[PDB]
Design a protein around this ligand. Structure first.
Ligand SMILES: CCCCCCCCCCCCCCC[n+]1ccn(CC(P(=O)([O-])O)P(=O)(O)O)c1
Lengths: 334, 334, 334, 334, 334, 334
């Protein structure tokens, strides 16, 4: 019941409007491990996002972030971002980090190290090919899924096979990040950041920003549907990853965010609203409301319902119509 | 791998308004077995329903349908029903049927044979007695529950007792079938098919179509309550059946349809809209919304809530009022 | 089987709108045991409630109620309350009480005895201190939690610890009761009933009724918030209690009311609507929408989420602001 | 049940003294899949062994054997080997192969195609280098390990990783094959078959048959120990492979053979009786006789005790003594 | 620790040749329940066995044995059997029986009653048709299986489905009983007791005692193999019954005896020794003596192995050979 | 990987005839922790036993042994014992010890400290009372069980209760040490050492060494039986301890030696061989022959059968006859 740990859960709730609850619901040692992992990841992400920090100053910070975890007094006072508090009071967070069992520390520091290098690499450039999209998503989210999987296994609450399957753990992260990148197009435009793959949107317009102009709305939706179709390809891996889980607290923690991401894609599919503001992630059909997302068979059913939601709205004229039906067919059939 | 299996799942979603998701969520071997079972039954159902097929031409098709499963090139191209695609492209479906392990084919083929016999038997006669209504329901639904039960046991996902207790399995089908027949009175009136037992409505009117007349509305609702009261007698068997299930995916699959059926009966009870149009399923109490139908105790609770919802709505002036309380009381006291 | 037992379940459904279904869903012997316990408490409640019964007659009735359970012919025919049926036909209920395994009777009678004495003590007084608030809530709710817990442990469907930790079981009762009391301020005002602790509301207004006056709305809300903060202190115990349960039917029974209570407090916090009418229970958002209260990890998540709903609304000007943050912060870190 | 499948199990029992029982004990789908896989591999092996078949007829037979699985009428009547029954009645076996799920079919056919290629390649030569020894074992045993692993994963009874980690699957086969080869030195000599690596035995004598001549025993045993030391290098992979298994029926199936092999290498190590007759696989040690190979920890314990048994009888004078100690040191230290 | 209970365990060990250990290994309350259930059955059987008792005197005893359990001072002193101590000191046994939970007492008392009735029924008549052989075994062993099954369920260490499946529990018993009878032809000979079905042996010789004559050895062995073939038909039910079990202590208790029975039938098939004195229980193979009978897959492999020992030694010239192969084939393929 | 860690396991295998394999099969960090713990204990043991070390020089070594763990270059070169290279190359061991986590280091050092003190104490005296026999066993074995139990709990592979209940953990050690002391009477004697309690043997002979004399064989066996009977009293604690373990690798590690000790007692009971040569463990029985020692119920069964092996061999005239029967009865009854 330390004051520093108290402060960490206070920061967790300040920064994680929607993950805090499921994290705090994790069994035993996973609870603190994941909470701290989230805080350090949040601090690292804040550094990356801060555009008042020059690239030459930022690179060292991203590269060396993992080592600060072991520097009791290290902190950063120049952030202007909204979640700067975890940076300004990082010693409180790093202290609890050093309080975690060594097995968790090793995993957390390793992920931070690798993520730092990955974030620095993409600072100067924009994502070009879809292969580079996967790479960038791997760095900022896939590594998180891998790190979490190792924490689950290290804790013994999940089978060691969970932490060992880096491929599907990576896909878990890729699906959430691609979804968020899809949904946040407009929010990111006004932020001066570009995440949509250039080799994909350049086939529709000259400037990614063009998707924001009312006269390019049809071309925007086509590209939107193409990127969503791309993201849906990770669902098989997601289902496979979730099917392996055996601990209920872990299952809830992993399954819920994925289903919310799926609901989000279904809501954004062929939706002009994506380019005019926030998308109305609305209700589902009477089968989704007779079963929640806390057991695998139910999670599958919920996922399939969302898939038919997209399937039924696929325009024949859409350049990606066949591939969209294809991946959904694959998900349905398995 | 199989592009034909994908087509089958495509058909499953085109023909199943709400079962596709839970069927696709079934564990291992049961997934394909139930998908294909559903499809052949749909094709058979389509033949029965087609009124452009004279009775003389139709009987041999119903009788030999179970054998067509082994005729690679067999198909039917003269149907005008909306699900005619499963008949026209039946070879794709029967191919996947022949790919199922033989122990599943045996079960499916047997139900198809027995169902053909029964459907043919009822082509030239309406349903008269209540015992005849059970007879018909057994033929088109009861056997499906028995078939599914034998598949569950043969797959070893459920206890051998599940497939052996043909009575409880039959009841699962009877409950759903009667519920739909009750609900679709009006829709069947325009289609020109009568399912409500003659011995029951013949005491309220001279022509089953009379309930359509807004002047006999009160007489209609009375008959409605009597049949609903009839259906409620299957519930104790449904509870017994569901309480023996141990596989979560099977449980979700079996429970949800039963719960949806019960909600429907509650919505239709002493409801006049049944004869004027679409009956809107009304939400449940605060407790039911707190739980989904995925664990036995929760399913019991949801079922009891729907019972009490019908109970405090029983008019003393209803000729069945006494019988309704009786069965509902028997359901409550176990 | 017996007509008296069904009569009991008929009464349960008439007098127990909120617990009937979950009680009937309980495993084995707990079913009848809790059904009867609820019926006898219902009768006791009805007597205490009935204002046409003189204090002279009521005191002896409350003190000796537990003994009526042993007198085969005892009944009361002078109640003017809606649920009087349980008093007039008490013989039927007492008969079933005597048919319960002796161990269950020991618990029900002991609770009725102590509850009667507690209710009699509060006939000629309102609630003064917060200490008297706990005392009162223990008499009408805490003891119920303790009795139920002892029944669970007696049935062996739960471990002995459940029935042994009376403090935690008591806390389950206090949380629900304080929540209802906070919620029903206005209704209880239009009923001449006072439950808000005078030692608390007197620090805001001269009379409790004043809170119903528009010019006092601000003081009323401050008081509302202080009491709510008081209620939140029982949450650690609620969590400890629920986390020890192992039976699904018992878990559904215990968890749902708690979640609904937390939701209520979340919706009532800093809400002026409490003093103008009945407050609309806000809906859970994001994670809470994808999970039901049927497994412990999910319930924790639901609870933590509603806690943040309150935390996000705490205005710095509120006099209890710091205390509200503190207890919540404690709930999060445990 | 089908008569052909019953016939397949009849052949399984005829051709597999040991494996038959553990194969029949495999859960669900793996039962028939492994039974059929074993039989076709038996038929292929029977053709590869038949020396009466002119290589002008043999190579195409081994190369195309995989294609015969799809030819209903194919069979081979010109064999005099003892298991010629599976060749003469191949249609019965291939029929059942075509009855297995497609996902198993592709695995079996693919392995048979590749094994066929490899067997034909080694028909005109003996093993030269140790690298050719691994290649040879890969073709006749390694591929079987890889095939079964793909069947285990496809059945979902084992993790996706079991099927993917082909290196480990390969090692399972290499270890059993090398073991049998080392142990069957004489039987091969009194048969005209040369399997021991040439580049290895040549450094000891001029002709492999020389190890049979009593005056070369000192060199024979020396060569024996080198080969054994070579095989021990697979044990680390065997432990890793076995450690991933989670299905008891599969574990029994996979573990038992490995333990018997390891025990064999223990009995043959530095034992000149290998060149005189048949070696007697004694019994476990004080501890090995207290545990069976049905759980991973026990299997590890058993493996270690055998390793230590070899470590003890290691001559300081033996040329491979240093290596033999190194490999064992690595195995016992993880 | 009760001294009467200690005495009961002293008797259990005295009256139990091979199963006292596994009974004492049973978890929790099953421990004493089964120990006492075995002692009372022991007494009940010792009564029927005693010939110094008249038929008209024995009948009432057997009929009321179940009632003696509730008569503290009841005891039989005129018996001169091997285990007469359980009769002379029955009060000690009944006392402990009366200390068992009522749920266990009901089961045990019920079985004794039904058993007593059945036993008396065969006091004057022999075993004629196999139909009657099953009726007999059902009374003296079959019912014991049902009893044990209900105790497992009542204790809750095993799923209620275990006690529910009376048919496979009955088979468990018939298999052991038929086995022992087959094995004890000689002992039952020097006792004047005939158990082999009349219709079966009479069809070989006119005097069932003939088989004790060297001149009818071949006539004998034939009848032997025929009866053994008869018993083998129970293996599918034994396998199915054992497969349902989930408790380890229950599994060891149920499986060990079944395996020993199978090993006995194996040793007795086509064996003259059966008519010359007790038979030896030969060795098995490594792929079993490397795994105890403590996990279902291992039990299956062990069973399948014994099935082969029978099959390999079936004489073409035996009148039942085809049927023997038939049932073994069915066991192998299922 | 670690050269020093490999050398460590090399010594573990040289100095541990019966623990190396089960130790190397321990999960996660228990593997190295236990390895090191066993190595340091072996070193401490090698010092106590070396008689080339004057008592005045031994006490300091024993008392400060625990401190040598933190002295990188401490070692011993004057030992003449066989396991002496664990002291000469002790820094290698101390190095790995310091590589372990603190929680593990804390435990080992604590036990090494407490053990050194105890050993030092019995350097001049011999065991007099049975009470001193326990104390002695406590210092050389009981503490080992406690240390190991605390290591299991710290690693968290087992619950806290394992390390807390020092009593049961102590018994585990006493049963093993007493069993070894009983078994090794002779070589201990031919080595000039005395461990049998004088208050027990002095009732039989004038000098413990007299049991080596042929003429005292009968008296030696009587004493042997009295000591064995004493050891048997720890069996209840052994079963309790084992029945609380939850990790398979931990269970195997703990159960195998105990079952080995029990078998040893059963073989030494009333056996003159104990005073002449070596006692060959006459294996278990045919019921426990189908059971290994890797699951609790089987372990119980194996233990109960060995108890009966002893029970049936108890001589009526043996002075401890009653005591032996008494404790065996207690074990049967629980
Ligand atoms: C086993 C499943 C694992 C899924 C892992 C998905 C990882 C997705 C990237 C997470 C990177 C760590 C957090 C970096 C800071 N960050 C940015 C956004 N967020 C999410 C927060 P938000 O943007 O909404 O303020 P919230 O939705 O949790 O409240 C957190």
């Amino acid at each position: 019941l330390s004051s520093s740990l108290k402060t960490c859960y206070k920061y967790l709730n300040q920064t994680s409007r929607s993950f805090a609850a499921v994290i705090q619901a994790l069994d035993g040692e996973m609870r603190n491990a994941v909470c701290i992992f989230y805080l350090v990841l949040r601090a690292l992400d804040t550094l990356e996002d801060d555009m008042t920090i020059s690239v030459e100053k930022k690179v060292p910070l991203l590269h060396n972030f993992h080592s600060f975890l072991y520097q009791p007094d290290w902190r950063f006072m120049e952030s202007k971002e909204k979640d700067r508090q975890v940076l300004e009071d990082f010693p409180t967070i790093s202290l609890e980090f050093r309080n975690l069992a060594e097995k968790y520390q090793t995993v957390i520091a390793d992920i931070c190290r690798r993520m730092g290098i990955g974030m620095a690499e993409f600072l100067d450039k924009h994502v070009t090919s879809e292969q580079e999209w996967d790479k960038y998503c791997h760095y900022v989210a896939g590594l998180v899924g891998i790190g979490l999987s190792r924490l689950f296994s290290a804790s013994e609450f999940e089978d060691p096979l969970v932490g060992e399957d880096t491929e599907r753990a990576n896909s878990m992260g890729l699906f959430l990040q691609k979804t968020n990148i899809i949904r946040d197009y407009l929010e990111d435009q006004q932020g001066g950041r570009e995440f949509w793959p250039q080799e994909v949107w350049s086939r529709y317009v000259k400037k990614l920003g063009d998707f924001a102009l009312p006269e390019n709305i049809d071309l925007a939706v086509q590209c939107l549907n193409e990127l969503i179709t791309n993201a849906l390809h990770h669902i098989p891996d997601v289902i496979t990853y979730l099917s392996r889980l055996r601990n209920q607290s872990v299952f809830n923690f992993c399954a819920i965010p994925q289903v919310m991401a799926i609901a989000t894609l279904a809501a954004c599919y062929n939706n002009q609203q994506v380019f005019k503001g926030a998308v109305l992630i609305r209700l589902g059909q009477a089968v989704t409301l007779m079963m929640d997302a806390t057991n695998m068979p139910a999670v599958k059913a919920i996922i399939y319902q969302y898939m038919e939601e997209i399937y039924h709205r696929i325009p024949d004229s859409n350049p990606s119509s066949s591939k969209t039906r294809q991946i959904i067919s694959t998900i349905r059939t398995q």
